[PDB]
């Protein structure tokens, strides 16, 4: 009955998506041809008369070199070929080109396949979109993707899983230019929106998973485990079951603030799993470490508004509420005085499943915390400084302006970003 | 104002040295294994539906092209094919056991 | 899918493509007759970027070879890889320019532009969607630099929003092989500053420096030099033909590198090159590849950015490589070198990675970086151009063909303004 | 006893009828010689006492090269040798020649065979006339064919299938001249007039059938499945059964408006049909898709008058009424205020039969849709412009005038056609 | 069923038809003895369109050869396929015309057209239902122009409602041969205005340019030029003899390309022609075949089609192909060339495809186009006639045979009216 639609936008969306959909098939025991050798698969797969399953995913891309690798590999028989949407020409790291020039040629094809998938749904819990701030139409076409979804669909959930531009490492020069102009869309047309930046995931894989040389496949296996633990309360029985709309309402203090931080615990190797036990209290303390956080910001600087936790495995409610008491006793961590009861707890019996060839090991007890802090103002004023530092001498403006957008729209992104950072300042003051 | 009595012999010697330097294609009929188009034959015009043989080499090329990368290559060539390369289960899939494998089960009232 | 159509200009223009079409033919496994001998099906997946399809399984390049002397093309046609081109693509005149820019621009340009634009309509209209065009030439002769400036001006006007890649070989004071070469260079860059999207500055001093000091070749005939130039030309636009973990095609490098429309002069350089004896004591790891890459020995321009400021940096990589190493090594060089990099643009570098390496090699990279050291080559060219124009040198072989004398002062006013822009961004 | 007679006039009727009769023969399990290796075949065949089946078809043409391929083809033994009526000289795309000076020699032969075929019938249901508006023989000779059938048979139903001249592509220069004079006959001597043009079949075969360049054979097989779906009610039983008189009353509100629009669903290739789940409640949406319409006109600009739906295969009557309720709740689909009961349902038990070498897929559920809309007003006004633009200073008129028809008949066809287009404007308005 | 009587006139006409019967008997597999030795039995389904059955399974062509000098036919009879013609149809006089239009029309024409009309009466009465006639001639000679125009006039008054088809080789200035060449062409166009249903215009300049630049032939012998013309004659009437999906015989193309009765002059062209070495460098596709059909180098008339407006266009195709590709190609050339095609007739193009191409070739193209550039040929012919007639050049040869001097004034008044009709509708 319950079901969602995945919208993998961009080259990062495809590499994330095939990491997620590889994990889903082995989780539900479905072969690459789609036929198995119970309604757990109903949330993402669609049943036909012949015994197959079609994933409810739409791949949004503007370059054919990233779709044809999907159509050639092992999963060529899995996905329906009309779900993979390829543009004729890439915007090539341009928000403006994917907003006014390139994106309106295939905006009709995306909304048509959205209509077909939502027609098959008997009741639609929400949408998941996957994209990155850095790229052109991963940030650009996503901006006009939300405009059509919000107007057509009123109160349907639309989750925005994003990748923030890292403060130090980058693969572009116009990367801060693309990120700030997407603040207009996400502030207005997003029910929820996560972010993890790549520099933080770089620190964890070096020291926790014991990998000298990882690529984006080992990062996207980690991000697949985050989404799997989120949606498994929809797919499997739980001692406490938490739906998609449940923790959506319970983490946001204001409609202007819908930006949690995601962390996962434990992340250890199969040789280090031979040594250390993994209990409920041991994995609870690991989510509060600023080293193991998956965003380069320190909650020790800021203040927690609310907390959402997602437990999986041999998890007893006795040990959950015992470890919460220990965390409130330590004075290194703080909570705002206007949220005394800030936690939310969910438990599922099924342990997380592992992928063959992956880096992690199979674990009984795991937790995926969703905490909203005032430490996100640390990673915004840094990017607002660098967006102001480049734009002081008026650089790269001729490429964006000449494509159709006026020069005053850059100044519009200044005040909306300046006002949004002011709304996070008034949260942290105590009454 | 050109001199055509010289232009014609310039073209003649040009074509002649092109004839001297011409080397033919060595009859290696290579075709792409991806896609080639067909034209549908007539229903009644029996000049189209003659009995005529079909190549088996290109059949083998189709049956080798429509295949998985693991079956094609012994070792992986690129990095984007690494996901899903090993699809085998390390433990047998005892999904029938409701003891250790909790799953959602349909009820008669909802259906 | 996305297409770049190749163009030639001059004796140096034809000889560059004669080695350029050879090196990528072996990259795509195409014999001199024109068959297919390949072991990987991925090569043929993206081959329509540079090859057109003919009957019987023939691939023909999308190149238009332009010259005013047919003795050069006859050496090209009699070469090992000269029979692949369709014979209609060779366009030739009957009288030469004689190393004079004005002869190849006004006098004999108008009678040969009708033929070359008659061909490039067929090379453009016959496909699905154009990504852009390509030109290679030299700024020392009146053949390549003559109508090569002027063939762009009509085809830019005909095709307004495309991508125009150009390879320009600037004249040099040490390898000065032509007396009138400052007159050729100044009036060509003047047309090039407004008519052109990208231009790479390669000089014969640095080509000689790399082959002598680094590669230790004893007898480097220009084919060996054209081997080094064409390897950079292949590596820049290798994302068009090969998918990667992170891809960046020609338009991706187009927007991000230029900060302003008037500064599209770059310096290429290459890394894996070593000498014949130094291979077995050398490894190929990402640090080794980036250590030798920002070294000034392997630069292919006659300028040193140690005296100047890196505006924007790029590097397009190839081979089996981890994302972190490509990112951690490039972070250090930005942070440690606080003087060579600009301060008003942070994270100056764009990065791309390609899974398919060049054959006979495991790892490779291609460098593009815009610096204020390019004004060293522009100032020394301009001062020789002003020195001869002061005393009425060689002018009647330009102004006697029907052109104004004051067009130079307008070109001089354009030339010193362009170097003034590089100073105020330095 | 319910029997019908098919008449293929001109070239266009022959290959359209060629696609039909090779489909009909395999639908009833008959050998190519016409002898079977059940009274269903009596609608379209007559059983000779020796054991051979003869089609109820009369092939008439003025050019011998299009019929001589049938006399030597695969089913050369199927037809009677005298039914393949062949003229001497073609009309050469002249409505004047095929109506007055060339068709007068062959009209005597064809009415004798219609009388001899209809004398064999113990009960008659309707005629099936196949042609196109563009060519001279399919236009001029059909004009005086139905004039003689009107005065011989009083209240007999005559289905008129015609290929409409496409707005953009055209294989003739005098093509708009033929269609304006042709409508004068069809306006009075036809009970229905099914309109399908070539250009929309080109686009539907591209994106749905995934064949980039269809020829006439792939075009007419789509036409054959529409005609086979209409006649499947007569030949085969069903939960709901319709006749030719059924939808003639139910789709023609006024005597001047008998031009329905016919589309088919699904049109899915064998590679894709392995993937999608095909149900009754989702193939009704494929009928009302503006891209899947078989006529180059926008149904969203016009207002619907009536719709006739003919489902085939495994169809349950709850699913058609759930699907109609889904359609009527939408706002893009519009209906006139003077017709709330705008639908009609037909369900048959036998699924459509695919042809070896065909492009379609073996599907249980298929639907044929017949609507009469106001969206065809724009499809004639675009051809009303072209005829009047020719007739500004008498283009190509001297060939028709010297034949034997007078100059004032071109204006009379324009006056009748201009009066007919004003009828759509006065009935399309709400009250 | 539908039959055409072929008719040949003059030295130019007889050599044109001798190659024509050699090339279409190859299509039907007829040996020079006249018997049948073929591979596909479709060649006897429609063979009575051009042939007469003889006893013993021998086929003879339906042709009549008229001439005034026996020195041409004995070369035709000594040719390769000269043994198939009936010796009765060889009709000739003994005294030559002397390249005088008045000789072949008034002096020696009245003695021979009694015999020639007796022969063609027997050939036309022996048909089942006559489609029409075919004539090959030239407008520069005494026999090709003089007797030919009178011979059509006698035919039309006997057979009023048929399809009269003529091929004419138009005189040209650069391949000017005779001094009285504008005299012959001007007096013959006067009759071709009011006496023939359609005329095909061929220039000798275009045949020389095609056979040297596109074909790249070493020796342009008259056989090779006539092989170019013979491919047009076979391709126009291929819908009578060869079945197809869409068909267009002579009368279907007669109505469609003639909007007004005084405009029946066409420009033919052929489009699968290729050079000597570009055989393997070519792709046989409909977009490739369409652009070369429209190519101005491949026009068989020595005037620029870009200088005028197309009235109607007919394209007759051959080979196995799919006509979704046909209609998309013809809308592309109409849409992108808005100025060239007329606006008072949307969809100027008409198409026709036949299943069987000529042997040795997969696909064939036949172009027939009605343009307003035909006035350039007629204006140039008119001025050369005006220059002669002002000073009364060479008139004493023509007026001494009984022809009045006012007939030239009536001929030029009739011809200059036709040129104004081209500009009236342009
Ligand atoms: N976390 C994470 N980020 C990625 C991954 N792949 C790409 N990115 C981000 O994506 C940004 C660049 O965008 P692209 O990968 O080119 O894809 P895109 O967003 O569609 O941009 P275009 O290719 O120009 O259309 C980089 O700044 C990266 O930060 C990935 O696998 N994981
Ligand atoms: N949809 C479709 N249209 C066809 C087909 N065959 C012919 N036509 C149409 O028929 C029109 C011309 O008429 P023809 O079929 O060629 O022959 P005709 O109607 O007898 O006219 P004449 O040949 O002059 O006697 C063309 O413009 C085509 O659009 C077909 O198989 N399918
Ligand atoms: N890099 C490089 N430069 C060359 C080569 N051949 C010639 N040049 C340069 O080109 C200049 C002369 O070129 P030229 O033959 O006159 O060019 P053209 O007039 O266009 O044919 C000299 O100054 C050389 O520096 C080559 O193979 N490589
Ligand atoms: N196409 C073609 N033209 C020819 C041939 N032979 C001669 N001509 C042309 O015919 C013209 C002379 O015509 P002529 O033979 O005197 O005509 P006649 O009086 O009927 O014999 C010359 O200008 C030639 O260009 C030929 O074999 N083919
Ligand atoms: Mg994208
Ligand atoms: Mg016909």
mmCIF file of N, CA, C and O in Angstrom, chain A residues 11 15 63-65 68 88-89 92-94 97 168-174 202 213-216 219 386 389-390 393-396 398-399, chain C residues 1-2 45-46 243-247 251-252 255-256 258-261 321-325 327 331 343-351:
data_model
loop_
_atom_site.group_PDB
_atom_site.id
_atom_site.type_symbol
_atom_site.label_atom_id
_atom_site.label_comp_id
_atom_site.label_asym_id
_atom_site.label_seq_id
_atom_site.Cartn_x
_atom_site.Cartn_y
_atom_site.Cartn_z
ATOM 1 N N UNK A 11 24.462 13.044 -12.489
ATOM 2 C CA UNK A 11 25.483 12.001 -12.512
ATOM 3 C C UNK A 11 25.735 11.453 -11.116
ATOM 4 O O UNK A 11 25.992 10.255 -10.945
ATOM 5 N N UNK A 15 24.986 7.320 -9.830
ATOM 6 C CA UNK A 15 25.942 6.555 -9.039
ATOM 7 C C UNK A 15 25.422 6.281 -7.634
ATOM 8 O O UNK A 15 25.740 5.238 -7.053
ATOM 9 N N UNK A 63 23.440 14.198 -19.658
ATOM 10 C CA UNK A 63 24.567 13.702 -20.433
ATOM 11 C C UNK A 63 24.376 12.212 -20.683
ATOM 12 O O UNK A 63 24.129 11.450 -19.731
ATOM 13 N N UNK A 64 24.484 11.751 -21.933
ATOM 14 C CA UNK A 64 24.217 10.335 -22.230
ATOM 15 C C UNK A 64 25.310 9.371 -21.794
ATOM 16 O O UNK A 64 25.097 8.155 -21.884
ATOM 17 N N UNK A 65 26.461 9.857 -21.327
ATOM 18 C CA UNK A 65 27.538 8.951 -20.946
ATOM 19 C C UNK A 65 27.292 8.286 -19.600
ATOM 20 O O UNK A 65 27.973 7.307 -19.274
ATOM 21 N N UNK A 68 24.010 5.393 -20.413
ATOM 22 C CA UNK A 68 24.357 4.222 -21.209
ATOM 23 C C UNK A 68 25.197 3.207 -20.441
ATOM 24 O O UNK A 68 25.296 2.056 -20.875
ATOM 25 N N UNK A 88 19.662 16.252 -24.407
ATOM 26 C CA UNK A 88 20.479 16.289 -25.617
ATOM 27 C C UNK A 88 21.851 16.893 -25.346
ATOM 28 O O UNK A 88 22.865 16.388 -25.838
ATOM 29 N N UNK A 89 21.906 17.972 -24.570
ATOM 30 C CA UNK A 89 23.163 18.646 -24.285
ATOM 31 C C UNK A 89 23.229 18.994 -22.807
ATOM 32 O O UNK A 89 22.232 19.418 -22.218
ATOM 33 N N UNK A 92 26.666 21.790 -18.378
ATOM 34 C CA UNK A 92 28.110 21.896 -18.157
ATOM 35 C C UNK A 92 28.440 22.866 -17.019
ATOM 36 O O UNK A 92 29.114 23.881 -17.209
ATOM 37 N N UNK A 93 27.949 22.515 -15.826
ATOM 38 C CA UNK A 93 28.145 23.276 -14.587
ATOM 39 C C UNK A 93 27.630 24.711 -14.727
ATOM 40 O O UNK A 93 28.360 25.687 -14.551
ATOM 41 N N UNK A 94 26.347 24.821 -15.060
ATOM 42 C CA UNK A 94 25.683 26.116 -15.160
ATOM 43 C C UNK A 94 24.274 25.999 -14.605
ATOM 44 O O UNK A 94 23.445 25.268 -15.157
ATOM 45 N N UNK A 97 21.868 27.796 -17.254
ATOM 46 C CA UNK A 97 21.584 27.030 -18.463
ATOM 47 C C UNK A 97 20.559 25.934 -18.195
ATOM 48 O O UNK A 97 19.678 25.683 -19.024
ATOM 49 N N UNK A 168 36.652 22.725 1.793
ATOM 50 C CA UNK A 168 38.025 22.724 1.309
ATOM 51 C C UNK A 168 38.150 22.065 -0.058
ATOM 52 O O UNK A 168 38.709 22.657 -0.984
ATOM 53 N N UNK A 169 37.641 20.853 -0.209
ATOM 54 C CA UNK A 169 37.766 20.123 -1.464
ATOM 55 C C UNK A 169 36.632 20.527 -2.398
ATOM 56 O O UNK A 169 35.488 20.723 -1.974
ATOM 57 N N UNK A 170 36.951 20.677 -3.681
ATOM 58 C CA UNK A 170 35.943 20.982 -4.684
ATOM 59 C C UNK A 170 36.431 20.497 -6.039
ATOM 60 O O UNK A 170 37.633 20.357 -6.277
ATOM 61 N N UNK A 171 35.472 20.249 -6.930
ATOM 62 C CA UNK A 171 35.760 19.848 -8.301
ATOM 63 C C UNK A 171 35.236 20.867 -9.304
ATOM 64 O O UNK A 171 34.961 20.513 -10.455
ATOM 65 N N UNK A 172 35.084 22.122 -8.886
ATOM 66 C CA UNK A 172 34.570 23.167 -9.756
ATOM 67 C C UNK A 172 34.993 24.523 -9.214
ATOM 68 O O UNK A 172 35.474 24.647 -8.086
ATOM 69 N N UNK A 173 34.808 25.544 -10.044
ATOM 70 C CA UNK A 173 35.036 26.925 -9.658
ATOM 71 C C UNK A 173 33.721 27.670 -9.462
ATOM 72 O O UNK A 173 33.597 28.492 -8.551
ATOM 73 N N UNK A 174 32.709 27.351 -10.272
ATOM 74 C CA UNK A 174 31.386 27.961 -10.160
ATOM 75 C C UNK A 174 30.543 27.200 -9.143
ATOM 76 O O UNK A 174 29.328 27.407 -9.052
ATOM 77 N N UNK A 202 35.034 11.634 3.628
ATOM 78 C CA UNK A 202 36.422 11.278 3.364
ATOM 79 C C UNK A 202 37.167 10.952 4.653
ATOM 80 O O UNK A 202 38.005 10.043 4.680
ATOM 81 N N UNK A 213 42.481 3.663 -0.275
ATOM 82 C CA UNK A 213 42.138 4.244 -1.574
ATOM 83 C C UNK A 213 40.688 3.949 -1.939
ATOM 84 O O UNK A 213 40.403 3.012 -2.696
ATOM 85 N N UNK A 214 39.744 4.724 -1.415
ATOM 86 C CA UNK A 214 38.346 4.574 -1.827
ATOM 87 C C UNK A 214 37.958 5.542 -2.937
ATOM 88 O O UNK A 214 38.560 6.600 -3.126
ATOM 89 N N UNK A 215 36.925 5.154 -3.673
ATOM 90 C CA UNK A 215 36.322 5.958 -4.727
ATOM 91 C C UNK A 215 34.869 6.232 -4.364
ATOM 92 O O UNK A 215 34.425 5.923 -3.257
ATOM 93 N N UNK A 216 34.113 6.812 -5.302
ATOM 94 C CA UNK A 216 32.721 7.123 -4.987
ATOM 95 C C UNK A 216 31.839 5.890 -4.853
ATOM 96 O O UNK A 216 30.704 6.032 -4.387
ATOM 97 N N UNK A 219 31.786 5.443 -1.063
ATOM 98 C CA UNK A 219 30.973 6.475 -0.426
ATOM 99 C C UNK A 219 29.488 6.216 -0.638
ATOM 100 O O UNK A 219 28.693 6.337 0.301
ATOM 101 N N UNK A 386 32.636 32.836 0.867
ATOM 102 C CA UNK A 386 33.303 32.507 -0.388
ATOM 103 C C UNK A 386 32.442 32.848 -1.597
ATOM 104 O O UNK A 386 32.978 33.145 -2.670
ATOM 105 N N UNK A 389 33.210 36.407 -1.686
ATOM 106 C CA UNK A 389 34.601 36.691 -2.023
ATOM 107 C C UNK A 389 34.836 36.589 -3.527
ATOM 108 O O UNK A 389 35.594 37.384 -4.095
ATOM 109 N N UNK A 390 34.198 35.620 -4.192
ATOM 110 C CA UNK A 390 34.314 35.525 -5.645
ATOM 111 C C UNK A 390 33.570 36.659 -6.336
ATOM 112 O O UNK A 390 34.084 37.262 -7.284
ATOM 113 N N UNK A 393 34.547 40.989 -7.140
ATOM 114 C CA UNK A 393 35.108 41.521 -8.373
ATOM 115 C C UNK A 393 34.293 41.134 -9.599
ATOM 116 O O UNK A 393 34.771 41.316 -10.726
ATOM 117 N N UNK A 394 33.085 40.601 -9.393
ATOM 118 C CA UNK A 394 32.078 40.351 -10.428
ATOM 119 C C UNK A 394 32.609 39.375 -11.485
ATOM 120 O O UNK A 394 32.770 39.695 -12.663
ATOM 121 N N UNK A 395 32.891 38.164 -11.015
ATOM 122 C CA UNK A 395 33.465 37.112 -11.841
ATOM 123 C C UNK A 395 32.400 36.113 -12.278
ATOM 124 O O UNK A 395 31.433 35.854 -11.555
ATOM 125 N N UNK A 396 32.581 35.574 -13.490
ATOM 126 C CA UNK A 396 31.736 34.537 -14.094
ATOM 127 C C UNK A 396 30.282 34.971 -14.256
ATOM 128 O O UNK A 396 29.397 34.128 -14.421
ATOM 129 N N UNK A 398 29.011 36.844 -16.710
ATOM 130 C CA UNK A 398 28.581 36.963 -18.098
ATOM 131 C C UNK A 398 28.013 35.655 -18.631
ATOM 132 O O UNK A 398 27.151 35.675 -19.517
ATOM 133 N N UNK A 399 28.485 34.516 -18.119
ATOM 134 C CA UNK A 399 27.940 33.238 -18.562
ATOM 135 C C UNK A 399 26.507 33.052 -18.087
ATOM 136 O O UNK A 399 25.650 32.603 -18.853
ATOM 137 N N UNK C 1 26.859 11.576 -30.904
ATOM 138 C CA UNK C 1 25.913 12.379 -30.140
ATOM 139 C C UNK C 1 26.320 13.848 -30.168
ATOM 140 O O UNK C 1 25.721 14.657 -30.876
ATOM 141 N N UNK C 2 27.345 14.185 -29.393
ATOM 142 C CA UNK C 2 27.954 15.507 -29.413
ATOM 143 C C UNK C 2 29.212 15.437 -30.267
ATOM 144 O O UNK C 2 30.020 14.515 -30.112
ATOM 145 N N UNK C 45 31.400 2.340 -28.901
ATOM 146 C CA UNK C 45 30.186 2.924 -28.331
ATOM 147 C C UNK C 45 30.111 4.427 -28.583
ATOM 148 O O UNK C 45 29.053 4.950 -28.952
ATOM 149 N N UNK C 46 31.221 5.133 -28.401
ATOM 150 C CA UNK C 46 31.318 6.564 -28.683
ATOM 151 C C UNK C 46 32.458 6.755 -29.676
ATOM 152 O O UNK C 46 33.607 6.971 -29.284
ATOM 153 N N UNK C 243 33.342 7.360 -20.925
ATOM 154 C CA UNK C 243 32.686 7.708 -19.664
ATOM 155 C C UNK C 243 33.629 7.550 -18.481
ATOM 156 O O UNK C 243 34.597 6.788 -18.515
ATOM 157 N N UNK C 244 33.319 8.289 -17.416
ATOM 158 C CA UNK C 244 34.145 8.269 -16.226
ATOM 159 C C UNK C 244 33.314 8.426 -14.972
ATOM 160 O O UNK C 244 32.104 8.661 -15.024
ATOM 161 N N UNK C 245 33.989 8.267 -13.828
ATOM 162 C CA UNK C 245 33.347 8.513 -12.541
ATOM 163 C C UNK C 245 32.932 9.971 -12.409
ATOM 164 O O UNK C 245 31.814 10.272 -11.974
ATOM 165 N N UNK C 246 33.816 10.890 -12.790
ATOM 166 C CA UNK C 246 33.504 12.312 -12.879
ATOM 167 C C UNK C 246 33.977 12.802 -14.239
ATOM 168 O O UNK C 246 35.181 12.809 -14.514
ATOM 169 N N UNK C 247 33.038 13.207 -15.085
ATOM 170 C CA UNK C 247 33.341 13.619 -16.445
ATOM 171 C C UNK C 247 33.263 15.134 -16.583
ATOM 172 O O UNK C 247 32.542 15.810 -15.844
ATOM 173 N N UNK C 251 32.620 21.708 -23.106
ATOM 174 C CA UNK C 251 31.811 22.808 -22.594
ATOM 175 C C UNK C 251 31.933 22.944 -21.083
ATOM 176 O O UNK C 251 31.716 24.033 -20.544
ATOM 177 N N UNK C 252 32.259 21.852 -20.386
ATOM 178 C CA UNK C 252 32.459 21.929 -18.943
ATOM 179 C C UNK C 252 33.710 22.729 -18.606
ATOM 180 O O UNK C 252 33.700 23.548 -17.681
ATOM 181 N N UNK C 255 33.167 26.985 -19.542
ATOM 182 C CA UNK C 255 32.587 27.998 -18.670
ATOM 183 C C UNK C 255 33.499 28.282 -17.484
ATOM 184 O O UNK C 255 33.728 29.442 -17.119
ATOM 185 N N UNK C 256 34.052 27.231 -16.879
ATOM 186 C CA UNK C 256 34.684 27.376 -15.573
ATOM 187 C C UNK C 256 36.064 28.019 -15.645
ATOM 188 O O UNK C 256 36.492 28.659 -14.678
ATOM 189 N N UNK C 258 37.513 30.347 -17.991
ATOM 190 C CA UNK C 258 37.623 31.765 -18.325
ATOM 191 C C UNK C 258 36.867 32.591 -17.287
ATOM 192 O O UNK C 258 35.676 32.349 -17.039
ATOM 193 N N UNK C 259 37.523 33.538 -16.619
ATOM 194 C CA UNK C 259 36.789 34.417 -15.701
ATOM 195 C C UNK C 259 36.101 35.550 -16.442
ATOM 196 O O UNK C 259 35.066 36.058 -16.003
ATOM 197 N N UNK C 260 36.680 35.952 -17.570
ATOM 198 C CA UNK C 260 36.201 37.056 -18.386
ATOM 199 C C UNK C 260 36.342 36.669 -19.850
ATOM 200 O O UNK C 260 37.234 35.887 -20.199
ATOM 201 N N UNK C 261 35.464 37.181 -20.725
ATOM 202 C CA UNK C 261 35.458 36.710 -22.124
ATOM 203 C C UNK C 261 36.714 37.043 -22.917
ATOM 204 O O UNK C 261 36.949 36.407 -23.951
ATOM 205 N N UNK C 321 42.134 5.391 -11.000
ATOM 206 C CA UNK C 321 42.519 6.237 -9.851
ATOM 207 C C UNK C 321 41.477 6.535 -8.761
ATOM 208 O O UNK C 321 40.294 6.698 -9.061
ATOM 209 N N UNK C 322 41.909 6.599 -7.498
ATOM 210 C CA UNK C 322 41.006 6.905 -6.383
ATOM 211 C C UNK C 322 40.639 8.365 -6.267
ATOM 212 O O UNK C 322 41.481 9.227 -6.461
ATOM 213 N N UNK C 323 39.399 8.652 -5.906
ATOM 214 C CA UNK C 323 38.931 10.033 -5.791
ATOM 215 C C UNK C 323 39.646 10.849 -4.739
ATOM 216 O O UNK C 323 39.918 12.021 -4.944
ATOM 217 N N UNK C 324 39.926 10.245 -3.600
ATOM 218 C CA UNK C 324 40.580 10.975 -2.536
ATOM 219 C C UNK C 324 41.973 11.488 -2.910
ATOM 220 O O UNK C 324 42.298 12.631 -2.613
ATOM 221 N N UNK C 325 42.802 10.662 -3.547
ATOM 222 C CA UNK C 325 44.163 11.091 -3.860
ATOM 223 C C UNK C 325 44.176 12.235 -4.844
ATOM 224 O O UNK C 325 44.963 13.159 -4.697
ATOM 225 N N UNK C 327 42.135 14.455 -4.935
ATOM 226 C CA UNK C 327 41.617 15.610 -4.218
ATOM 227 C C UNK C 327 42.562 16.062 -3.111
ATOM 228 O O UNK C 327 42.653 17.262 -2.830
ATOM 229 N N UNK C 331 44.721 19.725 -3.010
ATOM 230 C CA UNK C 331 44.436 20.624 -1.897
ATOM 231 C C UNK C 331 45.716 21.204 -1.308
ATOM 232 O O UNK C 331 45.755 22.384 -0.940
ATOM 233 N N UNK C 343 43.964 35.252 -4.866
ATOM 234 C CA UNK C 343 43.290 35.248 -3.577
ATOM 235 C C UNK C 343 41.801 35.542 -3.671
ATOM 236 O O UNK C 343 41.070 35.236 -2.723
ATOM 237 N N UNK C 344 41.331 36.114 -4.776
ATOM 238 C CA UNK C 344 39.927 36.480 -4.881
ATOM 239 C C UNK C 344 39.091 35.414 -5.576
ATOM 240 O O UNK C 344 37.896 35.631 -5.797
ATOM 241 N N UNK C 345 39.687 34.275 -5.921
ATOM 242 C CA UNK C 345 38.951 33.072 -6.314
ATOM 243 C C UNK C 345 39.526 31.884 -5.548
ATOM 244 O O UNK C 345 40.637 31.429 -5.857
ATOM 245 N N UNK C 346 38.829 31.360 -4.544
ATOM 246 C CA UNK C 346 39.298 30.158 -3.853
ATOM 247 C C UNK C 346 38.822 28.890 -4.547
ATOM 248 O O UNK C 346 37.815 28.882 -5.259
ATOM 249 N N UNK C 347 39.572 27.812 -4.311
ATOM 250 C CA UNK C 347 39.390 26.516 -4.973
ATOM 251 C C UNK C 347 39.411 26.682 -6.496
ATOM 252 O O UNK C 347 38.430 26.455 -7.205
ATOM 253 N N UNK C 348 40.583 27.104 -6.970
ATOM 254 C CA UNK C 348 40.773 27.515 -8.353
ATOM 255 C C UNK C 348 40.687 26.367 -9.349
ATOM 256 O O UNK C 348 40.575 26.629 -10.551
ATOM 257 N N UNK C 349 40.726 25.118 -8.896
ATOM 258 C CA UNK C 349 40.998 23.981 -9.765
ATOM 259 C C UNK C 349 39.715 23.211 -10.042
ATOM 260 O O UNK C 349 38.910 22.970 -9.135
ATOM 261 N N UNK C 350 39.527 22.834 -11.304
ATOM 262 C CA UNK C 350 38.514 21.878 -11.718
ATOM 263 C C UNK C 350 39.185 20.547 -12.034
ATOM 264 O O UNK C 350 40.336 20.508 -12.477
ATOM 265 N N UNK C 351 38.464 19.452 -11.802
ATOM 266 C CA UNK C 351 39.050 18.122 -11.874
ATOM 267 C C UNK C 351 38.110 17.172 -12.604
ATOM 268 O O UNK C 351 36.900 17.178 -12.365
#
